[PDB]
Homo-oligomer: A and B are copies of this chain.
């Protein structure tokens, strides 16, 4: 338990700590979520909103029909209206940056991590697309796997639709290869990520399903109001991941993600 935190400190000691961040480090600063976008497309697609349970297929498909019939101007316009908002940095970002990791990998389309890096003075090499890897300028990297809006708010610079998710291996091969090498060479700690997200439910599943026992186990920071159960913990230990529970130490209510995040990150930082 605590020895895992000690191992994390040893990893952060020399050169081998890499933080994998996700949507949990983005909701804190109130960057608008994806489901509100999904509802916005539905507003013009069908005519009236709905609610209830539907397949995650439909969740990811609703943008696809809008892409097919409306075209591309409407998609770009909706994206431009929805994301063109400036937000400040919640303290989790600087909490991550104070750890001084060798590399940090993100799936967010956001720019909060870049702004935080600029604020802290840590000059990195942001890699955002195919052409950027050829013109790398340093060693430490800021890899945005899912693409970003540096050039503009268009539908071709980011992965949002179904086809883009199904054509990743034929449109971003260098990014995939660099990510594979990064996870192979350095110890990985996951924070702020969900457990049903296709990005970190396949990129551990497929890669670790075929490998040998010479691999470094990655770490995941949980975010859920209830503490995890035992059987799930064991079966995930089988899959090759270690889980640092966020509800086995602190007790709170069901709308206080920020405090659990801060508690876990402060616990990790305390061993300095």
Contacts and interface: CB of A to CB of B under 8 A. Distances in A.
Given A55-B196, A231-B65, A238-B68, A184 B180 contact: no
A86 interface: no
B196 A57 contact: yes
Contacts of A253: none
Interface residues of A, number: 47
A84 interface: no
Given A65-B231, A69-B235, A196 B46 contact: no
Contacts of A166: 205, 209
Interface stretch (A93-101, A210-218, A263-271): A210-218
Copies in the complex: 3
A235 to B, nearest CB: 5
A37 interface: no
Given A184-B133, A184-B134, A231-B69, A174 B211 contact: yes
A248 interface: no
A272 interface: no
Contacts of A235: 64-65, 68-69
Given A173-B211, A177-B181, A235-B65, A201 B134 contact: no
Contacts of A234: 69
Given A53-B53, A57-B195, A69-B238, A134 B216 contact: yes
B69 A196 contact: no
Contacts of A132: 214
Interface in A43-91: 45-46, 53, 55-59, 64-65, 68-70
A178 to B, nearest CB: 6
Given A58-B196, A174-B214, A238-B69, A231 B45 contact: yes
Contacts of A56: 55-56, 59, 196
Given A134-B214, A185-B133, A231-B70, A177 B174 contact: no
Interface of A: 45-46, 53, 55-59, 64-65, 68-70, 130-134, 136, 166, 170, 173-174, 177-178, 180-181, 184-185, 195-196, 201, 205, 209-216, 229, 231-232, 234-235, 238
21 contacts: A45-B231, A46-B229, A56-B56, A56-B196, A57-B195, A58-B196, A65-B235, A70-B231, A130-B211, A132-B214, A133-B184, A133-B214, A134-B215, A166-B205, A166-B209, A173-B210, A173-B211, A174-B214, A177-B177, A178-B185, A181-B181
Closest 10 CB pairs between A and B? A57-B196, A56-B56, A131-B214, A181-B181, A55-B196, A65-B235, A69-B235, A177-B180, A45-B231, A130-B214
